[PDB]
């Protein structure tokens, strides 16, 4: 804890990135605690406890406590995630958009521009939608002034600016290095409530209570699902075979050495976060317009699938598998490997660069994400199954659990690799010189 701090402070490039990474997470909850004008936190706070929809609640835990208290970032990262994929699907549908994306850097930059103007259009639709939805029957709002044109107009302006800032803050820190703006926002929001509960439990009891018993069950579950993710992540699919022989001697034999070990064996990091972002995105807004004055049919469809009864589990689970397997197919890698091999003076047979190598990456890519997608659905049923006897825990198990493991495991996969050579270098230095 202390050691990792010295190590990342010691190399000056790491220091000043981890400065903004930490602070971003901090500034995320700065905004959430301080109410904004044109909407007041308290009226919103009771109104979301009463619910208009199970739909709304789900939406609230990804996006964080910035939708719970009436504050900027409320819409959150989730319209940008919904936008990026929708643009990528729309590229195939249109003849016109396909050409803009293919043509050079500038075309790919325009697509990327259209998506961020996209994102902001959906934000203004959601702020209109949310603002007028609330005080017209299911609740009432405003102590700054009572409802009216002024009240909704000012309300819109605030959240829109909020979302602009959020999208620019995510983009900023990707560029600089360390952490993604997608993982930053979801992570801040969900985990904020977690340490008081944990902190409470340790103090109260150690051999059991009731409240300890339910948390303790979830503690077995959490470790199981962590095991399974590190189980799928170890494997061997890296093929090593030196090109030619180039006489013998030197080491065990001096051949042109070409090691090609890619992959990791892990899928459903990025895709699982998209798949969930997308399906709640129509749904939540639909709910808002039918609790308020708007659509009653659009909401009904949302209910038909997502959670309410365990009959609806099988409809979210086909959609999860599907949206993940979709997202990966879009992401370019089924043939990346073969183009690289060519570029390097490293050649070989039994896997000769060109078309045959490509066919092998395309095989690899497919079975890999499909199996990572399957694990995701199993993981959900496992709390369901063990809870149908011993009580009904409702701590981190299912959706709650995956977000936390993926984020710490992504971030300290990349970050422990830098960190751990820093540690090694420190220890060997003390030992060789003085220390």
């Amino acid at each position: 804890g202390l050691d990792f701090q010295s190590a990342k402070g010691g190399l000056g490039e790491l220091k000043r990135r981890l400065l903004f990474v930490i602070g971003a997470l901090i500034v995320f909850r700065i905004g959430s605690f301080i109410p904004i004008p044109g909407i007041d936190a308290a009226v919103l706070a009771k109104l979301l406890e009463q619910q208009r929809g199970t739909i709304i609640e789900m939406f609230n835990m990804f996006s964080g406590g910035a939708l719970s208290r009436a504050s900027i970032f409320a819409l959150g990262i989730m319209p940008y995630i919904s936008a990026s994929i929708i643009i990528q699907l729309l590229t195939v549908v249109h003849p016109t958009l396909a050409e803009i994306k293919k043509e050079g850097e500038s075309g790919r930059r325009k697509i990327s521009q259209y998506t961020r103007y996209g994102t902001l259009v959906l934000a203004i639709f959601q702020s209109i939608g949310i603002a007028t939805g609330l005080p017209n029957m299911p609740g009432m709002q405003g102590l700054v002034i009572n409802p009216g044109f002024a009240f909704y107009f000012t309300a819109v302006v605030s959240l829109v600016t909020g979302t602009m800032f959020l999208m620019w803050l995510g983009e900023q820190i990707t560029e600089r290095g360390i952490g993604n703006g997608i993982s930053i926002i979801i992570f801040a929001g969900i985990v904020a409530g977690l340490p008081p509960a944990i902190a409470h439990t340790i103090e109260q009891a150690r051999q059991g209570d009731l409240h300890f018993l339910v948390l303790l069950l979830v503690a077995v579950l959490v470790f199981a699902v962590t095991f399974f993710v590190v189980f799928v992540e170890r494997g061997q699919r890296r093929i090593v075979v030196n090109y030619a022989k180039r006489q013998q001697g030197r080491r065990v034999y001096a051949a042109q050495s070409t090691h090609l070990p890619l992959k990791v064996n892990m899928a459903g990091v990025i895709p699982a976060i998209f798949a969930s972002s997308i399906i709640l995105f129509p749904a939540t807004i639909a709910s808002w317009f039918g609790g308020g004055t708007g659509w009653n049919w659009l909401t009904t469809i949302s209910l038909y699938l997502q959670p309410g009864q365990p009959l609806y589990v099988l409809l979210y689970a086909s959609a999860i598998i599907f949206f993940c397997f979709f997202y990966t197919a879009l992401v370019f890698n089924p043939r990346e490997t073969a183009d690289n091999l060519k570029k390097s003076g490293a050649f070989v047979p039994g896997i000769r660069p060109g078309e045959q190598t490509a066919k092998y990456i395309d095989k690899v890519m497919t079975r890999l994400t499909l199996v990572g997608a399957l694990y995701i659905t199993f993981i959900c049923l496992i709390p369901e199954f063990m809870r149908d006897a011993m009580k009904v825990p409702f701590y981190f198990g299912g959706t709650s659990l995956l977000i936390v493991v993926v984020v710490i495991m992504d971030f300290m996969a990349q970050v422990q690799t830098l960190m751990m050579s820093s540690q090694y270098e420190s220890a060997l230095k003390k030992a060789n010189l003085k220390g």
Partner: protein
Amino acid sequence: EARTEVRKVIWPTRQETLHTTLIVAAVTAVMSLILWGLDGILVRLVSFITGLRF
């Protein structure tokens, strides 16, 4: 057929495992500490912020 062919090559590619993953689970627990400790920082620094700006 078609769906059996996806399943009959996937049944031999289901391997991907190790033991000593309890090492990695001890670091999932240290990884958990980092999220508990960053969200406890929020309560600390954002409460100084609740004095001021709240």
